[PDB]
Coordinates of C-alpha atoms in Angstrom, one line a residue:
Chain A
X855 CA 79.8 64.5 85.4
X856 CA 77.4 65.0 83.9
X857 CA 77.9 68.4 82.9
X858 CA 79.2 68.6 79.3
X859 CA 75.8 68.0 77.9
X860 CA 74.5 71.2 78.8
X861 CA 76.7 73.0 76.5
X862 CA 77.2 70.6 74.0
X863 CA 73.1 69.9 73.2
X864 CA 73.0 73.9 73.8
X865 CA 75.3 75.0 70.8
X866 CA 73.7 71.6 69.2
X867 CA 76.6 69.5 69.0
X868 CA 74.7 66.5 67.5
X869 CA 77.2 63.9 67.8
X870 CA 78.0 64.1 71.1
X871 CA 74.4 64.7 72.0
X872 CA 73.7 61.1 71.0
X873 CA 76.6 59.5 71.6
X874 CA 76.6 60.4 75.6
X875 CA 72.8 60.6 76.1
X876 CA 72.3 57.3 74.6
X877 CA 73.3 55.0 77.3
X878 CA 70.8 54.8 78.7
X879 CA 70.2 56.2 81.7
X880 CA 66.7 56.6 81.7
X881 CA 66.9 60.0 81.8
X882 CA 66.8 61.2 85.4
X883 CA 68.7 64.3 84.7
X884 CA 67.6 65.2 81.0
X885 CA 65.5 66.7 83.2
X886 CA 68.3 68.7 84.7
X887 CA 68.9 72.2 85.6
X888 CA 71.5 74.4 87.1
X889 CA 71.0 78.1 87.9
X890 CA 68.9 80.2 86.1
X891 CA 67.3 76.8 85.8
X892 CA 67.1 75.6 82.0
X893 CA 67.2 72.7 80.4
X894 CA 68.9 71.0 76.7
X895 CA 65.4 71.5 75.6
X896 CA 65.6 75.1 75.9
X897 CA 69.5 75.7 75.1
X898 CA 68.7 73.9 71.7
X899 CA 65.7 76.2 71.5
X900 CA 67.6 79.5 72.6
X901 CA 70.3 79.0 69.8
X902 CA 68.6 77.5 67.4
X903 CA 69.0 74.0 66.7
X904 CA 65.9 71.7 65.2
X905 CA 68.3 68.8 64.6
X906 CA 69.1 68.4 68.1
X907 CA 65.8 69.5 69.8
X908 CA 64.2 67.1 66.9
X909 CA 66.1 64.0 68.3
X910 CA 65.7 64.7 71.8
X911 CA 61.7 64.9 71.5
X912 CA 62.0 61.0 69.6
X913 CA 63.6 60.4 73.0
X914 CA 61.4 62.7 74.2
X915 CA 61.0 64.3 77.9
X916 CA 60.4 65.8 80.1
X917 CA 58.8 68.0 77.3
X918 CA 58.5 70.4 79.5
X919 CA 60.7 72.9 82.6
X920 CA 60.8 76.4 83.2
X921 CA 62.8 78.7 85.9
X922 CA 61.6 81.5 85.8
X923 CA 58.3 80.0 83.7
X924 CA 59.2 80.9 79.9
X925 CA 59.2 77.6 78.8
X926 CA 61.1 76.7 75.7
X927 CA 58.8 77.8 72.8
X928 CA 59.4 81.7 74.1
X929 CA 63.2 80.9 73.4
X930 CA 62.3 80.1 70.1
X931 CA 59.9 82.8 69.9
X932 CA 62.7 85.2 70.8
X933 CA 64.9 85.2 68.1
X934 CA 62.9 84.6 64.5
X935 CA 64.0 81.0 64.2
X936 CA 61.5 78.6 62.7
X937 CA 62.2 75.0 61.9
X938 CA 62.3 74.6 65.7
X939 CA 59.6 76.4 65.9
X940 CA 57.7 74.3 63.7
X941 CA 58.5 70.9 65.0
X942 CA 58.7 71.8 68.7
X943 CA 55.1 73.2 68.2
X944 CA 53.7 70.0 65.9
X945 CA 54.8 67.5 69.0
X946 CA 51.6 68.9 71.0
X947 CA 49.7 71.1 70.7
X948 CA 48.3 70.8 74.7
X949 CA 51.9 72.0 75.8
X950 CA 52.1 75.1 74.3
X951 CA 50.9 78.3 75.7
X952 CA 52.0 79.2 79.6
X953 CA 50.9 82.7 80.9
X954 CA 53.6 83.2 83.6
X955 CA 55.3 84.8 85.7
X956 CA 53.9 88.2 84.3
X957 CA 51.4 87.2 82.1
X958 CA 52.9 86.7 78.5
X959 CA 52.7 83.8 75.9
X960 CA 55.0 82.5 73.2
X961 CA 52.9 85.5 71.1
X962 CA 53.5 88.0 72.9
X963 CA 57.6 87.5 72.8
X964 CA 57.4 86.3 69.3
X965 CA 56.5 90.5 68.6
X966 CA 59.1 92.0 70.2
X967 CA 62.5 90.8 68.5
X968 CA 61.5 87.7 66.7
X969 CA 60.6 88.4 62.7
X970 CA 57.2 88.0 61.0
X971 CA 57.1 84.4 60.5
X972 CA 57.1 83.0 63.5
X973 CA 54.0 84.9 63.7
X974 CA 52.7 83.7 60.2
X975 CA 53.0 79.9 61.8
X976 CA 51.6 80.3 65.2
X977 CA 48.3 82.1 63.7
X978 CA 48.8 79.1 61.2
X979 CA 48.4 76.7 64.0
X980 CA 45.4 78.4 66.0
X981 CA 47.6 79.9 68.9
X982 CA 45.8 82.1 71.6
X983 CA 45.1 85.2 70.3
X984 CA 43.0 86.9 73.4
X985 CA 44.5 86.3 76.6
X986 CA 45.9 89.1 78.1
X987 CA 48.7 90.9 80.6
X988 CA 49.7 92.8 81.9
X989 CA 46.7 95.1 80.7
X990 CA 48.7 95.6 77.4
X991 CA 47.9 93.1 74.4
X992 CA 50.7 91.4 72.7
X993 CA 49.9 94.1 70.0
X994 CA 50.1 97.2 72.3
X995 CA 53.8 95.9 73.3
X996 CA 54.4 95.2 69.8
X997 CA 53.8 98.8 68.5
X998 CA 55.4 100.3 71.8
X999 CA 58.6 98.8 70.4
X1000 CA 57.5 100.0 66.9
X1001 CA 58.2 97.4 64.8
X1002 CA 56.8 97.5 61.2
X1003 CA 56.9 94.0 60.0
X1004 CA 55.1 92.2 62.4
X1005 CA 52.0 94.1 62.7
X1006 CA 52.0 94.8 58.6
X1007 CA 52.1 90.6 58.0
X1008 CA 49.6 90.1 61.1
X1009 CA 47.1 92.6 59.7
X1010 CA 46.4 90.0 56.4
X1011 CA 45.6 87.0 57.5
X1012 CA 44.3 85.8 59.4
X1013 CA 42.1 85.9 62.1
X1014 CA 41.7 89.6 63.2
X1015 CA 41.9 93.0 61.3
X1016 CA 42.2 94.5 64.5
X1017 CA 40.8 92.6 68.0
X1018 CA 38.6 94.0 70.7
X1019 CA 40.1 94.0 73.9
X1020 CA 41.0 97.5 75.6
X1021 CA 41.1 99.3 78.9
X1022 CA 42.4 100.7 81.1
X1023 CA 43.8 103.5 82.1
X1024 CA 47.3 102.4 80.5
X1025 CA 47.8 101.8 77.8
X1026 CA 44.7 102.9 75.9
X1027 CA 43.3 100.5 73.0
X1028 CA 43.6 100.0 70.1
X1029 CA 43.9 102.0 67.3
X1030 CA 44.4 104.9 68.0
X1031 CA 47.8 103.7 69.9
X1032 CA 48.3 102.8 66.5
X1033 CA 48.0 106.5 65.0
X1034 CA 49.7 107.9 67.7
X1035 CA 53.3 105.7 67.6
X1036 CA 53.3 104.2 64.1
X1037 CA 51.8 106.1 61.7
X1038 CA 51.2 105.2 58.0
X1039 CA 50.5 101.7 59.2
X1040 CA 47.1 102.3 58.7
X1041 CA 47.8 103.4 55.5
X1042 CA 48.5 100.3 54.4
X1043 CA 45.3 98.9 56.6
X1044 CA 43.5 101.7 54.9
X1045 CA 43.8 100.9 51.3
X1046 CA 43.2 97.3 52.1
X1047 CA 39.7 98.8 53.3
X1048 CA 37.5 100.5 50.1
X1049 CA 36.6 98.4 46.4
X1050 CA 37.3 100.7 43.2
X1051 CA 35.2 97.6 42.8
X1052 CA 34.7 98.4 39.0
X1053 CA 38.0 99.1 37.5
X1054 CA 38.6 102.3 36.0
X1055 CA 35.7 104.2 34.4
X1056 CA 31.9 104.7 35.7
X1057 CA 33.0 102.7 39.1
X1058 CA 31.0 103.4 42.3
X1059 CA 32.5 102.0 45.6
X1060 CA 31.9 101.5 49.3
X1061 CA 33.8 102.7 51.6
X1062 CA 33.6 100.7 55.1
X1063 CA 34.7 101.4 58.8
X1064 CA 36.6 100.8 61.2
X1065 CA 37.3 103.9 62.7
X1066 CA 34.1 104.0 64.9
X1067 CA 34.8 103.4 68.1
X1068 CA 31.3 102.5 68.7
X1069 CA 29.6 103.8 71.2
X1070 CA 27.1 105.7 73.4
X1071 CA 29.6 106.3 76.3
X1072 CA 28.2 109.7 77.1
X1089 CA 33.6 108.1 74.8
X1090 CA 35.7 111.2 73.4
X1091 CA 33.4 110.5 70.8
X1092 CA 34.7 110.7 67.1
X1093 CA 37.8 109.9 69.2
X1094 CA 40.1 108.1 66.8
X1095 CA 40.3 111.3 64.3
X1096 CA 40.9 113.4 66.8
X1097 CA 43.5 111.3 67.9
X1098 CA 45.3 111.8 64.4
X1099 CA 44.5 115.7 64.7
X1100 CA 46.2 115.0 68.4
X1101 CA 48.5 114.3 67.3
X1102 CA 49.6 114.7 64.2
X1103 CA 50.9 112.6 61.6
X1104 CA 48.5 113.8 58.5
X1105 CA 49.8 111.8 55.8
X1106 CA 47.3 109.0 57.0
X1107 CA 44.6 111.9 57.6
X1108 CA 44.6 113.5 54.3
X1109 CA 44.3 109.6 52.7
X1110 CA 41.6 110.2 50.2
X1111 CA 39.8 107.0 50.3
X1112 CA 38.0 107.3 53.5
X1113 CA 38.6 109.9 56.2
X1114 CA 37.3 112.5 53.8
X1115 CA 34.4 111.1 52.8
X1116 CA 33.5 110.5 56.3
X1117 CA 33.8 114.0 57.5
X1118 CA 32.3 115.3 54.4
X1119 CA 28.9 113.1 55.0
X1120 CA 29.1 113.6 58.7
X1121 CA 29.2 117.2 57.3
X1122 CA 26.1 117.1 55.7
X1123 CA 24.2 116.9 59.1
X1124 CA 26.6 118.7 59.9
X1125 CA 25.8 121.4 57.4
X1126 CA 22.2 121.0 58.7
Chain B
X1369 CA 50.9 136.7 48.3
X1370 CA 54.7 135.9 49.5
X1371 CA 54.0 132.3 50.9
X1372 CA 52.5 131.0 47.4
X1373 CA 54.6 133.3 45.3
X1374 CA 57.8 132.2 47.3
X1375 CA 56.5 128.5 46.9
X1376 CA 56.1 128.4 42.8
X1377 CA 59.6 130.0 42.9
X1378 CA 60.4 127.2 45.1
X1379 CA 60.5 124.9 42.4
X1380 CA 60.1 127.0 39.2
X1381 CA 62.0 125.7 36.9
X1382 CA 59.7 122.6 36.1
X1383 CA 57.1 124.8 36.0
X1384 CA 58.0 126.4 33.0
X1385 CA 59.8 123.3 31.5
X1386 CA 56.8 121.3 32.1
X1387 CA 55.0 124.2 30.0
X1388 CA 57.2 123.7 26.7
X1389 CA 57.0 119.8 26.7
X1390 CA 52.9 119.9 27.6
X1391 CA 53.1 122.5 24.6
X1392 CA 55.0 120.2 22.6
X1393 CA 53.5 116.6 23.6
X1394 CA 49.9 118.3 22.5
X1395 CA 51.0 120.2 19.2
X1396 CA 52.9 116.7 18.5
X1397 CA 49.9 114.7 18.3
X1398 CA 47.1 117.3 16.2
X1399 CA 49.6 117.7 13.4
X1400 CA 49.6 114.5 10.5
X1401 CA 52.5 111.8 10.8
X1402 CA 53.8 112.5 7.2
X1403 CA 55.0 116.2 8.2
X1404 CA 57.6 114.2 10.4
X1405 CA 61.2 114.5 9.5
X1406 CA 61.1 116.4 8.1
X1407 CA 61.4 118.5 10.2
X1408 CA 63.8 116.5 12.1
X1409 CA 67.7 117.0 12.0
X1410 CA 68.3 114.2 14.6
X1411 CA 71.4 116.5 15.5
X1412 CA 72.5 119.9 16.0
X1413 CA 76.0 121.9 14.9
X1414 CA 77.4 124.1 18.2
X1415 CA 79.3 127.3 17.9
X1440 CA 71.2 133.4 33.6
X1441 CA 70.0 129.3 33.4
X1442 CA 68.7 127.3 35.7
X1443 CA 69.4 128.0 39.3
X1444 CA 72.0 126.1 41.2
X1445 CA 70.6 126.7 44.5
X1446 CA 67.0 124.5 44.8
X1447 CA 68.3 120.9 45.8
X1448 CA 67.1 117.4 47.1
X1449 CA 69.5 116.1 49.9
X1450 CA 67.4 113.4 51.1
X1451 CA 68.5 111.3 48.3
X1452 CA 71.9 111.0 49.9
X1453 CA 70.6 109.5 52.9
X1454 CA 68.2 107.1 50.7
X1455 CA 71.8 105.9 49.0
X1456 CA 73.7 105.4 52.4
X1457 CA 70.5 103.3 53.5
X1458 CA 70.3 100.5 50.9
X1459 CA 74.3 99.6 51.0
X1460 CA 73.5 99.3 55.3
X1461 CA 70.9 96.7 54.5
X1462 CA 73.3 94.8 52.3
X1463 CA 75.7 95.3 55.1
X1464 CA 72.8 93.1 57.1
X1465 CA 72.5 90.6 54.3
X1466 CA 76.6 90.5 55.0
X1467 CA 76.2 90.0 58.3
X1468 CA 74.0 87.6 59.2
X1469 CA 75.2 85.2 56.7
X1470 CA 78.4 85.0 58.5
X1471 CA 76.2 84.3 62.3
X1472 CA 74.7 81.6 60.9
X1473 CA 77.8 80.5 59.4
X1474 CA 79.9 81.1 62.8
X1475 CA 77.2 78.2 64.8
X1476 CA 77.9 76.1 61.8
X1477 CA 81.7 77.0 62.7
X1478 CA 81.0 75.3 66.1
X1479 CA 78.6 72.6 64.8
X1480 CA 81.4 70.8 63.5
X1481 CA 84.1 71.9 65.8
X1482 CA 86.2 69.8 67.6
X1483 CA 85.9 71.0 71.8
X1484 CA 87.9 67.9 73.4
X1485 CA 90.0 68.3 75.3
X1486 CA 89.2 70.7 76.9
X1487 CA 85.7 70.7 78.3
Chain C
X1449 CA 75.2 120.3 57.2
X1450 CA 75.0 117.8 54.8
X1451 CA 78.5 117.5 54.9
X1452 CA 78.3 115.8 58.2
X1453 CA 76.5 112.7 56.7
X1454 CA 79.5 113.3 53.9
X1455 CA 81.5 112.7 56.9
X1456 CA 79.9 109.7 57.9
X1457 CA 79.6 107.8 54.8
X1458 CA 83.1 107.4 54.0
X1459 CA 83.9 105.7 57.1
X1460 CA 80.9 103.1 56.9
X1461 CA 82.8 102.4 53.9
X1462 CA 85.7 101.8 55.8
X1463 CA 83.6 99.6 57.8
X1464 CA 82.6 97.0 54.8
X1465 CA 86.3 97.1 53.4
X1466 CA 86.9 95.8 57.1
X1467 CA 84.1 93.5 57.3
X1468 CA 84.4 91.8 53.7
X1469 CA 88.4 90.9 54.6
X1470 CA 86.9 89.3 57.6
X1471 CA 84.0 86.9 56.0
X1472 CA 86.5 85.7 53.5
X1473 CA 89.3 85.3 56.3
X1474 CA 86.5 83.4 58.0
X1475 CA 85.5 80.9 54.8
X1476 CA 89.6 80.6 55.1
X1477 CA 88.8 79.1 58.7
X1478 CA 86.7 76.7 58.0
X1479 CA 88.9 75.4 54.5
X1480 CA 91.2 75.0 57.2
X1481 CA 89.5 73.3 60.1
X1482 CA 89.7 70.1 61.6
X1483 CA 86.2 69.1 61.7
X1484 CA 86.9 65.5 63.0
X1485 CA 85.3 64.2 65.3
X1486 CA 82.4 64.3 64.4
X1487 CA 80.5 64.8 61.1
Chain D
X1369 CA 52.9 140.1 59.1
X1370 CA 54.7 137.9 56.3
X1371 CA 56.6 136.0 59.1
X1372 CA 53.7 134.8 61.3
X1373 CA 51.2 134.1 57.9
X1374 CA 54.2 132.3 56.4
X1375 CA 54.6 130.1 59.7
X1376 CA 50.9 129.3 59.8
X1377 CA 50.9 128.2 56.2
X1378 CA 53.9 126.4 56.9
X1379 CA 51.3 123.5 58.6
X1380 CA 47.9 125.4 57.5
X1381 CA 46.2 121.4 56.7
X1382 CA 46.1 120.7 60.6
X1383 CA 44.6 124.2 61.3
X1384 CA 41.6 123.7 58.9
X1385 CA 40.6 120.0 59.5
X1386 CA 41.8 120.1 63.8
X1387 CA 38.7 123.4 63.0
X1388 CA 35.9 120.8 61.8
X1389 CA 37.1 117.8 63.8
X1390 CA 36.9 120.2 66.9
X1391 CA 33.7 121.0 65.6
X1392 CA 32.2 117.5 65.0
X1393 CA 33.6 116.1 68.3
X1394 CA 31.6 119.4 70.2
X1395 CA 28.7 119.0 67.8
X1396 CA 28.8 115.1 68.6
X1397 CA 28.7 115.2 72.7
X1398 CA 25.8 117.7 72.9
X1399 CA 22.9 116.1 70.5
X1400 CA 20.6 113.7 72.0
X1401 CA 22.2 110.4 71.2
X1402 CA 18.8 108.3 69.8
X1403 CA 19.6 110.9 66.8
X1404 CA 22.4 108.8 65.8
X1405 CA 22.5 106.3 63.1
X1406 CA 20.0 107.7 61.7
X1407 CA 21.8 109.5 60.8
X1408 CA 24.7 107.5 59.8
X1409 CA 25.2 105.3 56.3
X1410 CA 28.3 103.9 57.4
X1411 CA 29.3 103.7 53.8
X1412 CA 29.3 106.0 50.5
X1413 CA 28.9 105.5 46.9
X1414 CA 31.4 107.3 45.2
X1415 CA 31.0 108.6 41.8
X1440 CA 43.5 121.9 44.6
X1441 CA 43.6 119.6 47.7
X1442 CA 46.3 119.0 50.0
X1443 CA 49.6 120.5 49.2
X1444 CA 52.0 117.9 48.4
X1445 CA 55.3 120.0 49.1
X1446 CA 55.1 120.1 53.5
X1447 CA 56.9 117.2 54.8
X1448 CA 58.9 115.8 57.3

């Protein structure tokens, strides 16, 4: 004693929960860990369980523990739970993102396994999009698993189309990973980008960017083409709406 | 002259079939509604075609996929309804 | 070759015909469980 | 003859456009770059391609 409410406020059997952790101690072991170090607040979090890890933050505490440093909000960002996710997050919002050991954030899990939404609600509640490590944004080791869902529901809303931050050497950034080891992705990206801004007959319309890298850099300049032609997938490349326009205007200098 | 040749033979016969109905959607619409059935029967009396060998195979593979998704929808169902198995399960003694 | 997938599809059947049994065997747990304490 | 022609057809799209990607990329690194953008609209008014049948 007191061991039983480890397991018990793990697999979130309420009941119990309340019944022994009411007493009240004061909590001096709630607030207790046993190796790998973790706490109730995690095992509800690991298995799901908003009921429990709801009543235990109106007692509260500590709020925060971590072994080897994931926190709690990474074990619900693990699997694609989201009730916990919700309310766990909506305590604070100050004790939320942790960067260690090897520099990751409740983001960064959240796309590997975990499903889209968890996603949907941490962009929904202004989580860190920019820091990164190791080298590799939370994107890169998204598509490196190549998951569709994720980086299809990301791409709408909100807060990039596609972010900045690249270098170096490995892994390269960022599109063109993107080419290379999901393709058709942009496809979807693609026709997102373009008007038919009058609708059907005697329509003109734009047909905006993204692919330029842009630079200067003389940085294996055109660069994101040639890294469909290398390689390979051309059923993105033959798209109508933009890559052929582009090289056929580039062509006229071209022609020139 | 073989590669494009080859590849109309490839799928031919809607080629030609495609030909008859174009024919027949665009002779269909010239000619004035009130020479319509007749001619029409609406039936037929009964009293070297198409080629068995061009297939699609893909499909089959498009059938198996569908039923392994509802095998998902199957499955996960019963996960969440195993942790509700020990939500309300009764662990004493022995702990 | 496509009668290898042939192959394999019959026995993913097999699979569901041994998975369905078990979800209904497992609704037959819980009509039969002793869920007290505690509710 | 028809065996080598036949295999190049078999993927001909990547041939033609990897020929003027290759040539825009070796185009690109050579001219002076304060010649760029001019020329370069960054967008276009708009106002027998590619085979449908290769696939994987």
């Amino acid at each position: 004693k007191k061991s039983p409410l480890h397991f018990a406020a793990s697999y979130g059997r309420i009941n119990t929960c309340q019944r022994l952790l009411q007493d009240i101690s004061d909590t001096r072991l709630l607030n207790e860990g046993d190796l790998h170090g973790m706490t109730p607040l995690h095992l509800a979090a690991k298995n799901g369980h908003d009921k429990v890890v709801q009543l235990l933050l109106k007692k509260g505490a500590l709020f925060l523990s971590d072994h080897n440093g994931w926190t709690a909000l990474h074990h619900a960002s693990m699997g694609g739970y989201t009730q916990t996710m919700k309310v766990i997050l909506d305590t604070n919002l100050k004790c939320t993102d942790r960067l260690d050991e090897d520099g990751n954030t409740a983001l960064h899990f959240a796309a590997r396994e975990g499903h889209a939404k968890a996603v949907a609600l941490l962009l929904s509640h202004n989580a860190d999009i920019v820091l990164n490590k190791q080298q590799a944004s939370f994107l890169h080791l998204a598509l490196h698993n190549k998951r569709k869902e994720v980086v299809l529901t990301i791409i709408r809303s909100k807060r990039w189309d596609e972010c900045l931050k690249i270098f170096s050497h490995n892994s390269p950034g960022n599109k063109c990973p993107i080419t290379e080891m999901i393709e058709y992705l942009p496809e979807c990206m693609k026709v997102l980008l373009d008007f038919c801004m009058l609708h059907s007959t005697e329509d003109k319309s734009c047909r905006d960017y993204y692919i330029e890298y842009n630079f200067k850099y003389l940085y294996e300049p055109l660069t994101a083409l040639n890294a469909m032609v290398q390689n390979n997938r051309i059923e993105l490349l033959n798209h109508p709406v933009c890559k052929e326009y582009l090289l056929m205007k580039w062509l006229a200098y071209g022609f020139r | 002259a073989v590669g494009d040749i080859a590849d109309v033979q490839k799928h031919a016969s809607l080629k030609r079939i495609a030909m008859q109905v174009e024919l027949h959607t665009s002779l269909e619409k010239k000619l004035p509604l009130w020479f319509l059935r007749k001619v029409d029967q609406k039936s037929t009396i009964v009293y070297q075609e198409i080629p068995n060998a061009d297939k699609s195979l893909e499909m089959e593979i498009l059938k198996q996929k569908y039923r392994l998704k509802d095998l998902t929808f199957l499955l996960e169902k019963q996960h969440e309804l195993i942790k509700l198995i020990i939500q309300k399960m009764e662990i004493i003694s022995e702990t």
